[PDB]
Target: Amyloid-beta 17-36 peptide
Amino acid sequence: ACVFFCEDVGSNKGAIIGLAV
Amino acid sequence: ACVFFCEDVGSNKGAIIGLAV
Amino acid sequence: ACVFFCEDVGSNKGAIIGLAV
Amino acid sequence: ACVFFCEDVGSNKGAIIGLAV
Amino acid sequence: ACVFFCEDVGSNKGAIIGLAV
Amino acid sequence: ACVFFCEDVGSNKGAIIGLAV
Amino acid sequence: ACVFFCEDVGSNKGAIIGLAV
Amino acid sequence: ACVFFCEDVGSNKGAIIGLAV
Amino acid sequence: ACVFFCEDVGSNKGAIIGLAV
Amino acid sequence: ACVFFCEDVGSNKGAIIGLAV
Amino acid sequence: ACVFFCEDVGSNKGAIIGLAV
Amino acid sequence: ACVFFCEDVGSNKGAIIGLAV
Model:
């Protein structure tokens, strides 16, 4: 899998986290 | 806006994320 | 302290975050 | 949205920047 | 000086670049 | 192209690498 | 090729960018 | 798990890769 | 706190370092 | 020595790793 | 060995650098 | 100019810093 660096929609500040896809 | 790499306050968690400002 | 990159235990969508250790 | 680290197309410049998607 | 990672307003794609301040 | 961070399929020790996509 | 981080000659606001060398 | 950035001893160039631990 | 990248005042060889702000 | 972030030549793999020089 | 991104102790300086371990 | 990420020889720990060249 790969890590996407995306805003967390489950965060009221749209913090950019790593998403493991 | 800017993206800064910061520890998210308010917790013990120690998470460092991209904050959009 | 150092910046670690770890899976966020508890997160429900396989998140990877910086961590201040 | 996500931020990817990509070479900006269309040029010779070779610039790599954060693209917001 | 420091490098801020910010959207370029002189870019029609808001590409995130390093700004030297 | 963009820099992706993905697991290295085939690698025997769970390696994560940049990938030029 | 390698990712270099260099000042963008020509840019009018002291920009620093990745560069594919 | 976390990603350690370490030389690969299974590489004759000691390339630094992400190790998933 | 956030990771800034700044010139190291005092350093005699134009060093750029992370800075915990 | 320096660490550069480069695509490892010789292959199709597209791996980008830290090279020590 | 590994490279970690850590604040260098012993000072007020707040410098974050790559430590080789 | 560009930033090289190199061990500081004026450091007894060979810490990797950004060198402005």
